[PDB]
Structures are given as structure tokens and as C-alpha cells.
Amino acid sequence: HEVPSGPNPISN
Amino acid sequence: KFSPQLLSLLSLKTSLSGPPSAFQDWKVPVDAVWCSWSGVVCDNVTAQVISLDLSHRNLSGRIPIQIRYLSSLLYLNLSGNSLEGSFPTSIFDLTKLTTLDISRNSFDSSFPPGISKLKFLKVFNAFSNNFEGLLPSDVSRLRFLEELNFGGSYFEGEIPAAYGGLQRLKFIHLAGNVLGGKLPPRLGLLTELQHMEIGYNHFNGNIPSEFALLSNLKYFDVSNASLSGSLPQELGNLSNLETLFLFQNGFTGEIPESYSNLKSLKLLDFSSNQLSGSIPSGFSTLKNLTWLSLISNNLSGEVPEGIGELPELTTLFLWNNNFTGVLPHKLGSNGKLETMDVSNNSFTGTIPSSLCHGNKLYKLILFSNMFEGELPKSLTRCESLWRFRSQNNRLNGTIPIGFGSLRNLTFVDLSNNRFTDQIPADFATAPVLQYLNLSTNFFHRKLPENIWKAPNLQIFSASFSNLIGEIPNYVGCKSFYRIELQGNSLNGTIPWDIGHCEKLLSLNLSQNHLNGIIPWEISTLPSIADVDLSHNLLTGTIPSDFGSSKTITTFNVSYNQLIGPIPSGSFAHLNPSFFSSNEGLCGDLVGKPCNSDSGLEVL
Ligand SMILES: *[C@@H]1O[C@H](CO[C@@H]2O[C@@H](C)[C@@H](O)[C@@H](O)[C@@H]2O)[C@@H](O[C@@H]2O[C@H](CO)[C@@H](O[C@H]3O[C@H](CO[C@H]4O[C@H](CO)[C@@H](O)[C@H](O)[C@@H]4O)[C@@H](O)[C@H](O)[C@@H]3O)[C@H](O)[C@H]2NC(C)=O)[C@H](O)[C@H]1NC(C)=O
Ligand SMILES: *[C@@H]1O[C@H](CO)[C@@H](O[C@@H]2O[C@H](CO)[C@@H](O[C@H]3O[C@H](CO[C@H]4O[C@H](CO)[C@@H](O)[C@H](O)[C@@H]4O)[C@@H](O)[C@H](O)[C@@H]3O)[C@H](O)[C@H]2NC(C)=O)[C@H](O)[C@H]1NC(C)=O
Ligand SMILES: *[C@@H]1O[C@H](CO)[C@@H](O[C@@H]2O[C@H](CO)[C@@H](O[C@H]3O[C@H](CO)[C@@H](O)[C@H](O)[C@@H]3O)[C@H](O)[C@H]2NC(C)=O)[C@H](O)[C@H]1NC(C)=O
Ligand SMILES: *[C@@H]1O[C@H](CO)[C@@H](O[C@@H]2O[C@H](CO)[C@@H](O)[C@H](O)[C@H]2NC(C)=O)[C@H](O)[C@H]1NC(C)=O
Ligand SMILES: *[C@@H]1O[C@H](CO)[C@@H](O[C@@H]2O[C@H](CO)[C@@H](O)[C@H](O)[C@H]2NC(C)=O)[C@H](O)[C@H]1NC(C)=O
Ligand SMILES: *[C@@H]1O[C@H](CO)[C@@H](O[C@@H]2O[C@H](CO)[C@@H](O)[C@H](O)[C@H]2NC(C)=O)[C@H](O)[C@H]1NC(C)=O
Ligand SMILES: *[C@@H]1O[C@H](CO)[C@@H](O[C@@H]2O[C@H](CO)[C@@H](O)[C@H](O)[C@H]2NC(C)=O)[C@H](O)[C@H]1NC(C)=O
Ligand SMILES: *[C@@H]1O[C@H](CO)[C@@H](O)[C@H](O)[C@H]1NC(C)=O
Ligand SMILES: *[C@@H]1O[C@H](CO)[C@@H](O)[C@H](O)[C@H]1NC(C)=O
Ligand SMILES: *[C@@H]1O[C@H](CO)[C@@H](O)[C@H](O)[C@H]1NC(C)=O
Ligand SMILES: *[C@@H]1O[C@H](CO)[C@@H](O)[C@H](O)[C@H]1NC(C)=O
Structure with a gap:
């Protein structure tokens, strides 16, 4: 399956 | 022969x-x-075959046991297929093998024990399977x-602690499994290790002090593991570390000044822990820092x-703390x-005048702070500005006039501020501006x-926001679907x-001084849903056209003075609160x- 990489992309 | x-x-082919x-x-x-x-x-x-690349040819079936006859094989790539079932042990008989890529297949059940038989394996990639x-x-x-x-x-x-015995290993990616337990400290003994990706598991305890020993570690990601506890201070010793992702965890305590x-x-992300403390003043010294x-x-x-003064800093996200x-x-x-994005803090002071200095800044989020003073006129000269949300502040003075020049400017929330005087007329020039909120401000002037x-x-x-004068005349009204003008002094007739305005959904004209008839053209709006005209001077009769409108949900006309019959139609089941205070x-x-007679007030 896909796993996330890189920085946390929470946004406003 | x-x-x-x-x-x-040929076994492989069939x-x-x-x-x-x-x-x-x-x-x-x-x-x-x-x-x-x-x-x-x-x-x-x-x-003899020394390399076989079978990757990315949609292919299914099982590897045949005859694959063991390629005994000189150094390189096998099965990556990116539909291959399925238990991993075939047949592979473990190719003992000259060096790199083996199993990735982006669906292999299931347990992993089989033979793997150690490949004495010389340098590279093993199993990413994205079903094990x-x-x-x-x-x-x-x-x-x-x-x-x-x-x-x-x-x-x-x-994670088997014996892994920490692999002293030529530079790259370990374990992330995205269900692995549990405490992270074995013996992992710190991996001497050549540079990349470590363990995140998106469910672990126990903390980062062990012993990881500080990974002299050459560059990338360290363990996120959305359930790691917790105080953040190990010995980690400051990792002098080659350029990527540190600890976010979406439970780490507590403060940021060791040793960091x-x-x-x-270069990149540092602690998002979404409970990390209470303050930013080490020593962070001035990270000259290569980019993401914070x-x-x-x-x-x-x-x-x-x-x-x-950080030279290389590009993104800075401080929001949802309490900084001052x-x-x-x-x-x-x-x-x-x-x-x-620094929003939802206690920040005070003026907005820095330099933020866009290189015309690379496209996202500026200041809202829900105590920022005070005027908006630097440099923001209007920032050609890359895309999204700007500064509301819920003390911002002052008059809104500078260069924003409509900006070719990318899409979203602007300036609301809940102290702005005064006149609403820049180039807002209606802004080529892509999608959303503009000026609400609750103090300019006493009319709409552009x-x-x-x-x-x-x-x-x-x-x-x-204290608006005066009439409502301008609605000429293009190309894209408007939500129009909020309520709570002003606007006078005149409704245009x-x-x-x-064909795409109009919600219209709030409430709480003004607006007189004259209610324009029937409202009922010809195809999509109109919410109409609030209440608390005005509107007179005359409610156009009968409105009962023919099958689209309209809230129509609030109260606290005007109108006369004549209420439209019968879709209006039949409407909240009767909507017609009150009209005597x-x-x-x-x-x-x-x-009253039913010859003379009525309608038509
Ligand atoms: C809608 O309202 C606007 C203004 O808003 C309201 O202004 C008055 C009516 C208050 O009751 C408040 O509720 C609001 O703030 C009206 O437009 C405004 O009209 C003004 C005159 O009615 C006009 O002022 C005039 O001032 C110049 C000089 O005028 C001479 O008289 C003044 C006092 O009137 C005197 O002190 C002065 O020294 C002068 O000798 C005059 O020459 C100007 O050109 C102007 O006519 C405002 O400028 C004007 N403001 C705006 C923003 O348009 C409007 O008439 C109202 N419409 C309706 C239908 O009622
Ligand atoms: C244009 O901007 C207007 C003003 O900037 C918008 O109207 C106003 O919107 C705000 C919130 O969006 C609203 O105030 C509310 O804020 C308080 C905080 O609510 C949250 O926080 C509390 C504790 O802080 C927490 O329990 C919750 O999570 C809650 O969601 C509330 O305490 C307060 O009572 C209120 O609910 C204003 O009332 C609102 N109206 C006005 C007249 O200011 C407007 O929505 C916007 N328009 C568009 C189209 O975007
Ligand atoms: C097994 O085969 C795989 C596919 O044949 C191969 O993966 C692909 O390898 C190339 C590298 O040669 C990557 O292509 C591009 O990578 C970067 C950007 O990500 C570019 O800068 C490069 O110039 C290059 O164009 C692919 O991204 C990569 N993945 C996929 C899905 O194609 C594996 O490398 C092979 N395994 C081994 C061990 O060699
Ligand atoms: C701004 O920050 C505060 C606290 O960091 C947030 O307020 C709390 O939000 C949580 C989750 O939504 C609620 O369970 C609490 O009840 C809130 N506390 C109070 C005192 O109301 C607030 O939501 C943040 N704002 C944004 C936009 O993220
Ligand atoms: C964020 O920190 C500040 C402290 O700088 C808290 O601000 C309030 O400060 C006043 C004095 O200026 C005192 O009444 C209290 O110390 C604080 N208020 C309260 C209700 O305790 C602010 O509350 C903090 N934000 C939080 C805790 O959400
Ligand atoms: C605009 O904002 C500034 C800052 O809040 C105000 O003027 C300054 O701040 C206080 C009042 O908040 C004054 O006592 C200072 O003397 C002013 N100077 C400096 C350097 O801070 C001003 O009152 C605000 N309102 C306007 C200009 O209408
Ligand atoms: C039009 O705007 C008014 C703003 O006053 C809305 O009515 C108020 O709604 C708030 C909820 O945010 C209530 O707390 C107030 O009590 C309401 N005012 C009154 C006088 O009752 C109204 O709902 C808006 N209409 C639409 C369709 O959005
Ligand atoms: C964090 O983990 C949970 C469950 O493991 C998951 O639902 C959530 O999406 C994760 N967060 C991110 C950003 O992927
Ligand atoms: C960093 O490494 C060495 C340990 O051998 C020493 O400089 C110092 O004790 C370490 N820092 C710590 C443990 O905080
Ligand atoms: C970052 O600092 C390192 C020190 O290890 C140096 O080698 C490097 O040149 C700096 N950054 C860049 C982009 O060169
Ligand atoms: C405007 O935004 C586009 C992407 O939408 C970007 O490619 C371009 O560089 C931006 N232009 C300026 C002047 O910032």
C-alpha cells in the first residue's frame, strides 16, 4: 500500500 | 545441449x-x-544470465521453481506487478544475488525464512506488498x-533488535506497517546508517538515547507512531542530520537547547505534539534550515x-501555539x-515590512493574533501573493491600494480589524480574486x-463594517454566489x-436603511436560496413572482413595513417568523x- 513521506502538510 | x-x-515466460x-x-x-x-x-x-528485469509488465502468476537455474544472477527486479501469494523461496537459491526488488506487488502471509542464504545481498526492496x-x-x-x-x-x-547488527546498512525504511513495541535501542549501533524511515506505525515509549550514536544519520522520520515522552537531548550530537520528522506524536517536555x-x-517538523516550552534562542545558528x-x-x-536572519528559511509554521x-x-x-502561517497565537506588534522581499511568498496567514498598525504597503507590491488571511487582529489605518495589481491573488480575509476610511477600488480589478471578506471594520465610506x-x-x-451610501448597481455579477452586506447604513433602493447575478445563492441585506419596493428580479434568480432583507425601510407589496420560485429556502422580510398579501406558493410552508413586524x-x-375586493394593492 502507499505510505506517506515528507513533512506534515496541515494547512490554513 | x-x-x-x-x-x-522459458519456465518464467509460461x-x-x-x-x-x-x-x-x-x-x-x-x-x-x-x-x-x-x-x-x-x-x-x-x-549466463547476470541480470533479469521483469518490472512493470502487468503480470500475474507464480514464480516457477526453475528460477533457481539462473545461478549467475546478480540482479532480479520483479517490481511493480500484480504478483500474488506467499513469497516464493525459489528466489533464495540464487546465491550470487546482490539487489532483489519485490516492491509494488501483492505478496501475502508470513515472510519465509530462507533470506539469509543470499550471502552477498546489498539491496533488498520489498516496499508496498501484502505481508x-x-x-x-x-x-x-x-x-x-x-x-x-x-x-x-x-x-x-x-522491530528485531538484531537488525542493529547490520554494519554496512545505510538505508532502513520500515514505515507504514503495523509494527508495535518499544524501539530497540540496539538500532543506534548501526554505524553507516544515514536514512531511517519508521513512521506510521504504532510504537511504545520514546526515541532511545542511543540513536544519538548514529553518526552519519541524515534523514530521521518517525511520525504518527505512538511515540511519547521527553524528547531525547543527546540527539543534538547528530551533526549530519538534515531531515528530522517527529510530527504527529505525543512527545512532551521542552525542545532541548542542544538541538x-x-x-x-534543513527541514524540522514537530507538528501536533504537546511540546510546551519555547524555541531555543540557539536556533539562530542553523544556517541551512529551510522548513521549520x-x-x-x-x-x-x-x-x-x-x-x-536565517538565510535559507522558506516555510515557517508556528500556528496553534501561544507565542507572544x-x-x-x-x-x-x-x-x-x-x-x-503564525495564526491563533498571542503575537503583537507590526507586520514585518520585508516578508515578500524576493517576490517568492505566496501564503501569508496571520489571523487570530494581536497584530497592530497599518498593513505594509510592500504587501501590495508582492507579485507572488496568492492567499492572505489576517483577520481577528488590531490592524489599523487604511487598506493600501495596490492589491488589484497582483496576478495571483485569490483569497483575502481582512475582517475583524480596525481598518478605516476607503475600501480600495482596485479590489474589483483583482484578476483572480475569489473570496474577499472586509466584515467588521471601521471605514465609514461607500462600497467601491x-x-x-x-x-x-x-x-x-x-x-x-460601517458602510454608507447606496449599493452599487450590480453590472457584471459574474461569479458572486455569497453576498454579505448586513449591519451597515446603506441607503437607497435595492438595485x-x-x-x-445568476450564480447567487445567499444574499444578506439585513439591518440597514434601505427603502423602496422589493425588486421582483430576485425571483428570476435560478439558484437563489437565502434572502435576508429584514430590518430595513422596504415598503410596498411583496412581488407575487416569489411563490413561483421553487428554489428559495429562507426569505426573511421581517421588521420592514410592507403591505398586501404574502405570496402563496413555495412561500406557503415558510417560517412565519419571516413576515413579522410588518403590520x-x-x-x-x-x-x-x-381583504378580497376589486381594488387590491398587487399587480
Ligand atoms: C445616503 O447617505 C449619504 C451619506 O450618509 C449619511 O449622511 C447624512 C445624510 C447622515 O444623516 C448619515 O446618516 C450618513 O452619514 C448621502 O450622501 C451624502 O450627502 C451629503 C448631503 O446630504 C453630502 O454632504 C455634502 O457636503 C458638501 C458641503 O455641504 C454643505 O453642507 C454641509 C452639511 O450638508 C455643511 O456642513 C458644509 O460645510 C457645506 O456647506 C457638499 O457640497 C457635498 O458635495 C455633499 O453634497 C455627502 O458628501 C454625501 N456623502 C456620501 C458618502 O455620498 C445621501 O444623500 C443619502 N441618500 C439618500 C437617498 O438619503
Ligand atoms: C467574514 O468574516 C466575519 C468576521 O470576521 C465572519 O463572521 C463571524 O465569524 C466568527 C467566526 O468565524 C463568529 O464569531 C464566533 O467566534 C467565537 C469562536 O468560535 C469558536 O471558538 C470557540 C472558543 O473560542 C470554540 O468553543 C469553538 O470551536 C468555536 O467554533 C465564538 O465564541 C463566537 O460566539 C462566535 O460564534 C462571528 O459571530 C461571525 N459574525 C460576525 C458578525 O462577526 C463571517 O462568517 C465571514 N464571512 C464569510 C462569508 O466567510
Ligand atoms: C526496478 O525497476 C524499477 C522500474 O523499472 C526501478 O524504479 C524506477 O527507477 C528509476 C530510476 O532509474 C526512477 O526514474 C526517475 O527517478 C528520478 C525521479 O524520481 C529522476 O531524477 C530520474 O532521472 C528517473 O527518471 C523511477 O522513479 C523508479 N520507480 C518507478 C516506479 O519507475 C527500480 O529502481 C528498479 N530497482 C532497482 C534495485 O534497480
Ligand atoms: C485556536 O487554538 C485553540 C487552542 O489551541 C483552539 O480552541 C480549542 O479547540 C479544541 C479543538 O477544536 C476544542 O476541543 C477546545 O474546546 C477549544 N478551546 C476553547 C477554549 O475553546 C481553537 O480551536 C484554535 N483555532 C483553530 C482555528 O484551530
Ligand atoms: C497565552 O499566554 C498568555 C500569557 O502571556 C495568557 O494571557 C492572559 O494574561 C493575562 C494578563 O495579561 C492573565 O489574565 C492570564 O495570565 C492569561 N489569561 C487567562 C484567562 O489565564 C493566555 O491566557 C494564554 N492563552 C491560553 C492559556 O489559551
Ligand atoms: C494605529 O496604531 C498605532 C499603534 O497601535 C496607534 O498609535 C501608536 O500606539 C499608541 C496607541 O495604541 C500611541 O499611544 C502611540 O503613541 C502611537 N505610536 C507608536 C509608535 O506606537 C494609533 O493610535 C492607531 N490608530 C490610528 C493611527 O488611527
Ligand atoms: C443575516 O445576518 C444576520 C446577522 O445579524 C443573521 O441573523 C443573526 O444570526 C446570528 C447567528 O450568527 C444570531 O446570533 C443573531 O441573533 C441573528 N440576528 C437576529 C436579529 O436575530 C441572519 O441569520 C443572516 N441570514 C442568513 C440567511 O445568513
Ligand atoms: C495518523 O495515524 C492514524 C492511524 O494510524 C491515521 O488514521 C491518520 O490518517 C494518520 N495521520 C496522517 C496524517 O496520515
Ligand atoms: C555528545 O557526544 C559526546 C559523547 O561521547 C559528548 O560530547 C557529550 O556527552 C554528548 N552530548 C550529550 C550526551 O548531551
Ligand atoms: C550546510 O552546512 C554543511 C555543513 O555540513 C555544508 O557542507 C553545506 O555546504 C551547507 N549547505 C549548502 C547548501 O551547501
Ligand atoms: C503566479 O502563480 C503561478 C501559479 O499559479 C506561478 O507559476 C507564477 O510564478 C506566479 N507568478 C508570480 C508573478 O508570482
């Missing part, structure tokens, strides 16, 4: 099922024939292993001024700042005369051509049925 090489390859494009190339005419085949690489001398149960402990016997990737399967249990020594450090993200922690401090003091006013001066000419403006809200209204809803 009997060629094992040919038996092996056993793996794919489109013609796959094995059509492999044919025996009526002299070492296989070396010309797709992805088959012979040894110049022996004519379950324990990580194989045999891997710990591979002396030359450099890259190990088991990420993206369903493996459970603890000011992570001198190679502390979002959604309990940090309370003053941002060290030196961060304004002022932003470093030197901030944008590196000319590299790209996004910045061209405001409804805005080409792309969908949502415009000026409510409860007859409101009909030109001349007539009909079934208000419980004063209508």
Missing part, C-alpha cells in the same frame, strides 16, 4: 501471465539466444546489506530574533520566504462603485438589476386573512 538457462527463462507486450520479445529461432531478450543481460563471457506477521529475523545475518525496505505492508510486532547544534539541519514547523503544540515563548512578543522584523529579508464588476469574486462579505402584511401565515 541442455541449457538450464533456457529452461529457466508461468507469468501478462499482455503480449511482455514476453513477445522472447523467441527461439530454428546460439545463446536469450541474451537478446527484453531485460535479459548475459555475462559477456559465460552467457503479515513478524519482520524476518534472518535479515540480521546479511553482512553486506546496504538498503533494506519492508515499508508499506502489514508486518506486526517489534541548536544540528548544524546540517512547530504547529499545534503547547509552546509559549518569544520567537528568537535570529530566525529573521513580535515577529522578527528582519523576516522576509532573505528573499526566500514562501509560506508563513465597480465592486460587482469583479470577474471571479464568488464570496464578498462587508457586513458590520433593480440584481437579476444579473400591513396580509394572509394565512400571519393569521390576518386578506
